[PDB]
Symmetry: C3
C-alpha cells in the first residue's frame, strides 16, 4: 500500500467517524517513555488493524493503537506502538501514519527517543533538544522519500534547514528552567544509525570527528515526512550512555541498561511534555 492521498484519506475518514476528536498535536514516544499516553482524557483507542490501509505490525507483535483525546485542554493523537525501519518496514509504511495525522489536522509533532552520547559532556540521564541531524541512510539511497513524490503532500526536493522548530526548542528549555532541571538539558546534532546493532566503538569515534552530539536508530524518517508536509517538529533524546567514554574504557552497553535509564527519567519526561502540550502557541 502506497502512502498516497487516496489511501491516507480513507484512513482519516474512518478515524473521524469513530473518534469525534479533531487533533492539532501529534505525539510519538520512545521505548519506556509512553506513560503520558495512558493519561489522555476522554480518550478513544483505535487498533491499527481496524484502520483502512494502516501497516501490518503483527510480526513484531506488542501493542499497536492510535489514541485520541485531550491533554492540558488540547486535542491530541498518539501512536501507541512505533514503527522502526530496522524492523524491515518500507518507506510507505512509515510515512502513512504521519500523512494521516496531517489530514486529521495535526500542525505540531512531538517526538522522544533513547540515544547514545557522543559529545563528551553528555551523561547518562541527560536530555538533548535536537537542532539538526546527519542522515546516513539518506546519503546512502535509503531516504524515507525515495520513490515517486506524492505531490498533494509536499515538494519533490524538500529543504530540511528548519525541520526542528526554533521556538519549540526555546519553550522546552523555558519550562525546564521554571522547574529547576535546566542543568539536565542540552542541544545537539543527531546521527541516524539505521541499526539494529548499536554503534561500534570505532563508529562512535568517527561520529565524534564528524560533529555529532548523539546517535540513535529512529526519529529522522518521521521528521522528514512531517517537514515535507508542513508539520512543525520538536524532538528530544534521552541519553542512555556516553558511547565515547565506553569506547575509551572498553565497557559494554545493552538494551537492559538503556531501559533502566528510561525508568529513572520517565516521570520527569511525562510532566515536561504535558506542560509543553499545554503551553504550545
Amino acid at each position: 500500500v502506497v502512502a498516497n492521498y487516496e489511501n491516507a484519506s480513507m484512513a482519516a475518514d474512518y478515524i473521524k467517524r469513530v473518534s469525534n476528536v479533531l487533533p492539532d498535536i501529534g505525539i510519538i514516544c520512545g521505548s519506556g517513555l509512553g506513560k503520558l499516553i495512558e493519561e489522555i482524557e476522554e480518550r478513544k483507542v483505535i487498533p491499527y488493524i481496524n484502520i483502512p490501509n494502516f501497516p501490518k505490525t503483527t510480526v513484531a507483535g506488542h501493542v499497536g493503537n492510535l489514541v485520541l483525546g485531550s491533554v492540558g485542554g488540547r486535542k491530541i493523537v498518539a501512536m501507541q506502538g512505533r514503527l522502526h525501519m530496522y524492523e524491515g518496514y518500507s518507506n510507505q509504511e512509515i510515512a502513512l501514519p504521519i500523512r494521516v495525522m496531517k489530514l486529521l489536522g495535526v500542525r505540531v509533532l512531538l517526538i522522544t527517543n533513547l540515544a547514545g552520547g557522543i559529545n563528551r559532556k553528555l551523561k547518562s540521564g541527560d536530555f538533548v533538544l535536537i537542532k539538526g541531524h546527519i542522515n546516513f541512510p539518506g546519503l546512502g539511497l535509503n531516504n524515507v522519500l525515495v520513490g515517486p513524490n506524492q505531490d498533494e503532500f509536499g515538494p519533490r526536493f524538500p529543504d530540511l534547514s528548519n525541520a526542528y522548530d526554533r521556538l519549540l526548542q526555546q519553550l522546552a528549555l523555558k519550562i525546564a528552567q521554571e522547574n529547576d532541571f535546566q542543568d539536565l538539558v542540552h542541544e545537539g546534532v543527531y546521527a541516524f544509525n539505521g541499526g539494529p546493532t548499536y554503534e561500534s566503538p570505532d563508529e562512535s569515534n568517527m561520529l565524534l570527528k564528524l560533529g555529532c552530539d548523539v546517535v540513535g536508530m529512529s526519529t529522522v524518517p518521521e521528521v522528514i515526512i512531517a517537514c515535507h508536509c508542513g508539520i512543525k517538529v520538536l524532538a528530544v533524546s534521552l541519553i542512555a550512555n556516553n558511547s565515547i567514554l565506553d569506547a575509551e574504557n572498553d565497557v559494554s552497553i545493552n538494551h537492559e541498561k538503556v531501559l533502566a535509564v528510561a525508568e529513572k527519567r520517565a516521570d520527569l519526561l511525562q510532566m515536561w511534555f504535558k506542560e509543553i502540550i499545554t503551553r504550545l502557541p
Copy 2:
C-alpha cells in the same frame, strides 16, 4: 528486465533500424540544461515506450525520448528525460540505456547536473569540472553494480581511478579560456547524496570536513556504468548555491532558486558543450 547483453542488443537493433545514425558521443543533460538537444540536426526522436526493454517512466511523467543526429559535424545520441535513483528506479533500469549507448558505438559520454557548493570559494553560477567522487550509496551497499556481473560489458571489480578523463577536462578548460569565461570554471570532488531531500546544514558541514567540493543527487551511477564498459566521461556541475554559507547564515534553498540559476547559465553551457563536441579528438 535485467541490463544484460541480450536485452541491450534487442534495444540497439530497434534503434539502428529506425534511425540510420551511428553515434560515437552520448549526452545526458541536467534540469533546465537541455536546450542543446533541440538543436540536434537531421534528427530522429525515438520515444522510450517504443524501444524494446527500455524502462517504464510514466509514473514520473514528463518527456522521455532518445534523440539521434548531428552536432558540429559529429554523430550523437541524447537522453531527453533522465532517470534518477531517488525516483525509485532500480540498478538495472538506470544501467540499460548506457549499455545500449555502448552497443550503438558511443565512446565518450558528456554529463551536466545542478549541485550545491561546499568549497567556500564556489559561488552561485560557477561551473565545476568533476575530477573524482565520494559515493555514499556505494559505500552503503546501494552501488549501481550490486547484483550479478554482466561479464560481456565489464569486470566484476572495476577501478574508478580514471573514471573522469583528464584530457577532456583540459579541453573543457581550454575552450573556456578561448571565450573569456575561465574565471567561472573550477575543478573538484563530487559527493553523491542519494536524495531527494537537499543536504541538511549539518550534513553540509560534515562534507566540508571530508574533502568534498560539491554535492548532488545524480551522475555517479551513470559514471560507474560508463566506466565499467570502457566509455570515457566528462561531467560538469552548475553551482546553484553555497550550502556552507547558507548553513552559517541560517538561509534556505529550494528548487525554484536552483532553476533560476539554470536559466541564467543555460545559453553559455549550451555553446560550451556544442564546442566541446565539435573539438573532441
Copy 3:
C-alpha cells in the same frame, strides 16, 4: 527463505545425518586463500544444492560446498564458496549458513579476506588482525540484521564492542612470533565498502581522515551474525595494495594484481591458520 530457527534446524539435521562430524570451529576463506580446505582430513563434501534451505548460488556459479572433517586434531566445518552482498544476496541468505554452524556446535569462526591498505605503514603482502570496524551499510539502513529479530539466536539490539576476540588476536600474533614473521603482522580497523567497485581515490582519502586502517567488501556481515548468536571471531586481512599511496601517485589497481598477492602469501597463511586451529583453547 528466512534465516529462522525452523529452517536452520532442517539444514542442520540433514548435515548431521550425512557427515557424522560435530564441528566446534568454522572457517570462511578469502579469494585465493582456500588451500587449507583441500587438506581437511577424513572429510565429507556436501554440495549446497543438497542441503535443505541453503541459498541458490548457480547465477554466480563456481564452487559451492560445505566441507567437514579434522584439522590438527580438531573438528571443523568450512564454507567452500563464499556469499557476498555485492552479488545481490539478501540478509537472510548470508545469515542462514552461519546460523546452521551455530546449531551444529560451532563456537569459534575464523575468517580471511583481501583488502586495501589505508594506514600509510601497510605494504602489499602484510597481514592485519582486525580489532574493530566501520560499517557503512549498517549506518545506512543495509545492516545484515535489518528485519524481524530471530529471538532464538540473539537479541534485538546486539553490542559489537567484543565482536573481535582479544585472546584469539593474541594467539595469532604469538604464532607469528614463534615462526619469525611478526614483522608482517599489524592490527587495525576495517572499513566495509559494500562494493563491487574498488574505493575511489577520494573515498580512500576520506577513510584516512575517519580512522580506518584497511578497506574491503566482505566479512562484516558474517561477523555481525556470529556475534549476535554468541560465536567468537578472528578475522585477518591480507593487504593487496596501499590505496592512499596509489591515490597520491595516480596509480591503478585491479583484480589481477590482488590475486598475485594472494598467491605469494597463500602457503604462509595456510600454515598459520592450521596452527591457530591446532592451538585454540
